Amino acid sequence: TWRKWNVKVNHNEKRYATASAIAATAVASLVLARGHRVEKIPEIPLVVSTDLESIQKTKEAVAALKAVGAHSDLLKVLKSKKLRAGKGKYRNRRWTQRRGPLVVYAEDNGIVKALRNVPGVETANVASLNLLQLAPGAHLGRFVIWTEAAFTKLD
Amino acid sequence: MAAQKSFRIKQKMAKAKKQNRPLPQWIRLRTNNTIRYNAKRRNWRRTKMNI
Amino acid sequence: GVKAYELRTKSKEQLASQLVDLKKELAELKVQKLSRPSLPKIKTVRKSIACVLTVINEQQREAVRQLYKGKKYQPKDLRAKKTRALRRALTKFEASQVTEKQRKKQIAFPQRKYAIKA
Amino acid sequence: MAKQSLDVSSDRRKARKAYFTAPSSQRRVLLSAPLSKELRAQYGIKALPIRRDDEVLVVRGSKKGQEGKISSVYRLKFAVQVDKVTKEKVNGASVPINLHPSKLVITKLHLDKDRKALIQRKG
RNA sequence: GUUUGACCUCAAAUCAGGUAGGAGUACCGCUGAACUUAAGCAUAUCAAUAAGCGGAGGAAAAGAAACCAACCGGGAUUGCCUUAGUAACGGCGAGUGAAGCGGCAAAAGCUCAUCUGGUACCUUCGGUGCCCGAGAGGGCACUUUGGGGCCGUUCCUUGUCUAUGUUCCUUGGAACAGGACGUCAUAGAGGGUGAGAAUCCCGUGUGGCGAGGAGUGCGGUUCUUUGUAAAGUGCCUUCGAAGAGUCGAGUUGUUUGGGAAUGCAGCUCUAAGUGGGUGGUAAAUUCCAUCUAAAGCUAAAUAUUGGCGAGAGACCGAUAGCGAACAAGUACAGUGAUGGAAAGAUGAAAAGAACUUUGAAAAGAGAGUGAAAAAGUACGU
RNA sequence: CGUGGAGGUCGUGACGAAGCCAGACGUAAGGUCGGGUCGAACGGCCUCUAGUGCAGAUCUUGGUGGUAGUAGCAAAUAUUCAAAUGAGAACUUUGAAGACUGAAGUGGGGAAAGGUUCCACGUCAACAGCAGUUGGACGUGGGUUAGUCGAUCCUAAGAGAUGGGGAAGCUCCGGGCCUGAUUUUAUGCAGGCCACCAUCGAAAGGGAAUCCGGUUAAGAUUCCGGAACCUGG
């Protein structure tokens, strides 16, 4: 009976949490603190062209993470995938995977389908960013690639 | 006469005796799963054929 | 063997003759009792004895349905049509009849439906 | 889970319950065994249900490397018996050894009238 | 004085036609408790609860104002929201406990006060052919003035397809490992598979494609009757279809937040007819402000400790979760109502222990199978 | 500090969890590893949540020790002795010899009830408070034959269908029969009577008729061989 099991959020708390989380992708020390592998940069975040919506396949998506040395982060989820204990194994929780790239897109239409296939990737739009995207596990400083139109929208 | 003569009743008590019989070897053999102890088994002194 | 399709092609006289052979043949399978066997013909004869009774019942329904389409009839066909009391309750039918006439007409009028319509 | 929408399925709890107990057909989907490469090219499917007149190669078992005609498929707990693919009792009589169809790959098939027509449809 | 044929009222039969009784889990209308609370108790509370009874549907029930009102405006009815622990009740103790509004979900206004049966005919929710029984007004300028069929699409059902490694070495009984090499992904959800698999298989995927169906509305096409009367706009008077043991009263109840002022029952008594009712005690007036009961219908939005299908999950994981993971409402107890358990697991493969010695038989010995028998049958640990 | 689960982070794994002995500490909650078992999964950290830690509650449930090889297997005194059979015999069976039962502390035949226990055969794990070749265990077949027995029929103490009336309601009290034209097929037109009305209720009230013996492994006044009789229409 009964238990709520809904926590209300304060708008003011929540905005602060999102903004700080985005900002955490800016300071590198905090990204490194979270457990991100990252090099070539760690000038941070990456801004990529508005042409990236028009990425159809997966061959381009894996390739694209290669140039900013960021493919390394892709490697990290490709292995090291924990075979969970528990009841979750009955459900669908059997593997838990590490959270790698985030790519955030500007377009109303929906997330970049291509970029979604990478192991441990999540894809989002700026309109529908949340705390979880920028900081999975509430540990901030996830590696992201922001589209330029995404970047203006972020503001 | 006797006993208990009612035709309808007689049949039910008779029908029941056959229904309480041992299994056929085969169902153990093509087999489902079951240490197959029938269960329905009804008994000489003991229990009661049913009130 | 017996297939459903063969029984339909056969006549009302011919299927009756089949039912007669079938009972004889089932009767011989009674006699062949001392063994066990004898049945892969009785299970299938049981199915055959059912098929021949069905096929005749179906022939008589269809023939009846033709004869009666011309006239008036139908307690028996009525039972198939409703498929009882609830689906019957959902009838009379009520729907077109209910708005069969008052005040709709006034309300409106349509050159208008067309005119707009593209 | 995935293609999460308003639909019937996902669903490990059901999937297991479903595939294990199986109606006769989910044992049909189970009837499918991967084709050999010559067949994959002509017919244009990875796997199709395997036949009695077909010839089948064993991949998985110790049995592997052996070929024979498929004697039966026992639908109900989904398994296939292959001819000469037998195991031996103590008494010394030999009775067949059940195989999962995933284990085998189907070397040759008998085309069939409907099954060829549907195979052509699959293509 | 007396009968006979015929008219209508009541009755009984009869066969026909038409429908109901019963049922499914809860949801959904009445009659009506208690312990319990107030640390007692009797009003109050529990509670208009539970129960019992009646009965309907896929939702039900309610509905276009004799409303709201405390102003000046709103404008049918549910539900949601909150009004508010406010008003109000109450040993004014304990407790009890709204509405109007505001705005949402969703919207819709109308309708009362020739029909049927028989037989015939057809393309049988119909009509024709026959026979039989039973908001209103005047005259003028006009403008507005139909349905049916067909196909496609709308929505439901169903089937089919359909990416990419099964490579090397090593370990192993087995690679689904490591290291090495390589591939797809619009499919890195999940399952199976001799181990820990995107690429073996199922599937999977923003997935595509084919067929079948009631019912409707959008679009396209196609048939065809006259008309008449309705309706708008404007002039003229005018006005009924507007519901009685009702409205209202007392005296007796019970119910409610309802308090002189909730709603309902009972007994008694009892109006008017554009007159009447309401506006939170009762009584003159003009008038204000609102509305016409004693009648009815009605889509949609809400419920469903769920019959029927499916998803989901920091749920549980075999003394837990259902009573029930299997033969479970089984086995079994009780005269009956009713009560009610324990109950899963060999192995990659049955390869599920030949043959022999010994034995009454049960069994043991050796031996065989397997990576493993202290893996040998209620057999994982 | 420790627990199950979630997510993220750090990883770990075909010999993991789990187990028991030990080995190292942390006062301590616990902690870590090893033997040698086991043959698939598990930690840490951060953050969280909760079917979150037990000796106990005449606590729940299961299992187990002592109590014990202990009480009971004792009042009809009933067997004994050859022998049959069997792998096995105090209790199965044969004989002999002996008692006991006696309106039935053990005859005959049935009513209720049981529900196949009957009969045959073959087993002995389980049962019979012990053996057990035995049995009524178990398993596997088989057996019950009705015009004349009895139910059916009747009506009885009343279950009471059954106006009307309370109660929403559940619930509860208080014409039918016989024909005549035809015609012998029963079609068919037409006429005439009469009181307090249904069914059920006793397998032991009352009541239409059957005995004699013969046969079966197991039926019998049923079947049969003879003989008889009844009931209806």
Curated annotation (Swiss-Prot), chain A:
Q: Which residues of the full protein are shown?
A: 105 to 259 of 362
**Subcellular location(s) per record:** Cytoplasm; Nucleus
Post-translation: what modifications?
N-terminally acetylated by acetyltransferase NatA.
| Transmembrane parts of this sequence | none
- What is the annotated role of this protein in its UniProt record? Component of the ribosome, a large ribonucleoprotein complex responsible for the synthesis of proteins in the cell. The small ribosomal subunit (SSU) binds messenger RNAs (mRNAs) and translates the encoded message by selecting cognate aminoacyl-transfer RNA (tRNA) molecules. The large subunit (LSU) contains the ribosomal catalytic site termed the peptidyl transferase center (PTC), which catalyzes the formation of peptide bonds, thereby polymerizing the amino acids delivered by tRNAs into a polypeptide chain.
Q: What else is known?
A: There are 2 genes for uL4 in yeast.
Oligomer status and interactors: Component of the large ribosomal subunit (LSU). Mature yeast ribosomes consist of a small (40S) and a large (60S) subunit. The 40S small subunit contains 1 molecule of ribosomal RNA (18S rRNA) and 33 different proteins (encoded by 57 genes). The large 60S subunit contains 3 rRNA molecules (25S, 5.8S and 5S rRNA) and 46 different proteins (encoded by 81 genes). uL4 is associated with the polypeptide exit tunnel. uL4 interacts with its chaperone ACL4 and the nuclear import receptor KAP104.
Q: Which family does it belong to?
A: Belongs to the universal ribosomal protein uL4 family.
Which species does the entry assign this protein to?
Saccharomyces cerevisiae (strain ATCC 204508 / S288c)
UniProtKB/Swiss-Prot annotation, chain B:
Q: Where is this region: Disordered?
A: 1-22
Quick one: signal sequence residues? none
The alphabetized UniProt keywords are: Cytoplasm, Ribonucleoprotein, Ribosomal protein
Disulfide pattern: none
Q: Which GO terms describe its biological process?
A: cytoplasmic translation
Q: Which GO terms describe its molecular function?
A: structural constituent of ribosome
> Where is it chiefly localized?
cytoplasm
The organism sits in which domain of life?
A: Eukaryota
- The UniProt regions of compositional bias labelled Basic residues, in chain numbering, are 7-20
What are its GO cellular component terms? cytoplasm; cytosol; cytosolic large ribosomal subunit
UniProt subcellular location: Cytoplasm
Q: Which Pfam families match?
A: Ribosomal_L39
Q: Which family does it belong to?
A: Belongs to the eukaryotic ribosomal protein eL39 family.
Subunit details: Component of the large ribosomal subunit (LSU). Mature yeast ribosomes consist of a small (40S) and a large (60S) subunit. The 40S small subunit contains 1 molecule of ribosomal RNA (18S rRNA) and 33 different proteins (encoded by 57 genes). The large 60S subunit contains 3 rRNA molecules (25S, 5.8S and 5S rRNA) and 46 different proteins (encoded by 81 genes). eL39 interacts with YIH1.
PANTHER family according to UniProt = LARGE RIBOSOMAL SUBUNIT PROTEIN EL39, RIBOSOMAL PROTEIN L39E
Q: What does this protein do?
A: Component of the ribosome, a large ribonucleoprotein complex responsible for the synthesis of proteins in the cell. The small ribosomal subunit (SSU) binds messenger RNAs (mRNAs) and translates the encoded message by selecting cognate aminoacyl-transfer RNA (tRNA) molecules. The large subunit (LSU) contains the ribosomal catalytic site termed the peptidyl transferase center (PTC), which catalyzes the formation of peptide bonds, thereby polymerizing the amino acids delivered by tRNAs into a polypeptide chain.
Curated annotation (Swiss-Prot), chain C:
Domain of life of the organism encoding this protein = Eukaryota
Q: Which GO terms describe its molecular function?
A: mRNA binding; structural constituent of ribosome
For the biological process aspect of GO, one term held by this record is: maturation of LSU-rRNA from tricistronic rRNA transcript (SSU-rRNA, 5.8S rRNA, LSU-rRNA)
Modified positions (Phosphoserine) in chain numbering: S11, S48
What CDD domains does this protein's entry cite? Ribosomal_L29_HIP
Please list which residues make up the signal peptide.
none
- Which SUPFAM superfamilies is this protein grouped with? Ribosomal protein L29 (L29p)
Q: Which key words tag this protein in UniProt?
A: Cytoplasm, Phosphoprotein, Ribonucleoprotein, Ribosomal protein
Main subcellular location:
cytoplasm
Segments forming a coiled coil: none
The protein's location, in the record's own words, is: Cytoplasm
Q: Which PROSITE patterns match?
A: RIBOSOMAL_L29 (PS00579)
The cross-references to InterPro entries, in alphabetical order and at most eight, read: Ribosomal_uL29, Ribosomal_uL29_CS, Ribosomal_uL29_euk, Ribosomal_uL29_sf
Keyword check for Ribosomal protein: yes
What GO cellular-component annotations does this UniProt entry give?
cytosol; cytosolic large ribosomal subunit; preribosome, large subunit precursor
Q: Subunit composition?
A: Component of the large ribosomal subunit (LSU). Mature yeast ribosomes consist of a small (40S) and a large (60S) subunit. The 40S small subunit contains 1 molecule of ribosomal RNA (18S rRNA) and 33 different proteins (encoded by 57 genes). The large 60S subunit contains 3 rRNA molecules (25S, 5.8S and 5S rRNA) and 46 different proteins (encoded by 81 genes). uL29 is associated with the polypeptide exit tunnel.
Family to which the UniProt record says this protein belongs:
Belongs to the universal ribosomal protein uL29 family.
Q: Which PANTHER family would you find in this protein's record? A: 60S RIBOSOMAL PROTEIN L35 (PTHR45722), LARGE RIBOSOMAL SUBUNIT PROTEIN UL29-RELATED (PTHR45722:SF2)
Q: What else is known?
A: There are 2 genes for uL29 in yeast.
The name under which this protein is listed is Large ribosomal subunit protein uL29A
Q: Which organism is it from?
A: Saccharomyces cerevisiae (strain ATCC 204508 / S288c) (Baker's yeast)
Gene for this protein?
RPL35A
Curated annotation (Swiss-Prot), chain D:
Q: Does the keyword Cytoplasm apply?
A: yes
Annotated PANTHER family = 60S RIBOSOMAL PROTEIN L26 FAMILY MEMBER
Question: Could you tell me which species this protein originates from?
Answer: Saccharomyces cerevisiae (strain ATCC 204508 / S288c) (Baker's yeast)
Q: Is Transferase one of the keywords?
A: no
This protein is called: Large ribosomal subunit protein uL24A
Q: Which GO terms describe its biological process?
A: cytoplasmic translation; ribosomal large subunit biogenesis
One Pfam assignment: KOW
Q: Taking the first listed entry, what is the main subcellular location of this protein, grouped into a coarse class? A: cytoplasm
The family note in this entry says: Belongs to the universal ribosomal protein uL24 family.
GO terms of molecular function: RNA binding; structural constituent of ribosome
Its GO CC terms are:
cytosol; cytosolic large ribosomal subunit
Miscellaneous field? There are 2 genes for uL24 in yeast.
Question: What's the subunit arrangement here?
Answer: Component of the large ribosomal subunit (LSU). Mature yeast ribosomes consist of a small (40S) and a large (60S) subunit. The 40S small subunit contains 1 molecule of ribosomal RNA (18S rRNA) and 33 different proteins (encoded by 57 genes). The large 60S subunit contains 3 rRNA molecules (25S, 5.8S and 5S rRNA) and 46 different proteins (encoded by 81 genes).
Alphabetized UniProt keyword annotations: Cytoplasm, Ribonucleoprotein, Ribosomal protein
Q: Per its UniProt record, what SUPFAM superfamilies does this chain match?
A: Translation proteins SH3-like domain (SSF50104)
* InterPro entries in the cross-refs: KOW (IPR005824), Rib_uL2_dom2 (IPR014722), Ribosomal_uL24_CS (IPR005825), Ribosomal_uL24_euk/arc (IPR005756), Ribosomal_uL24_KOW (IPR041988), Translation_prot_SH3-like_sf (IPR008991)
Spell out the subcellular localization from the entry: Cytoplasm
NCBIfam families associated with the record: rplX_A_E
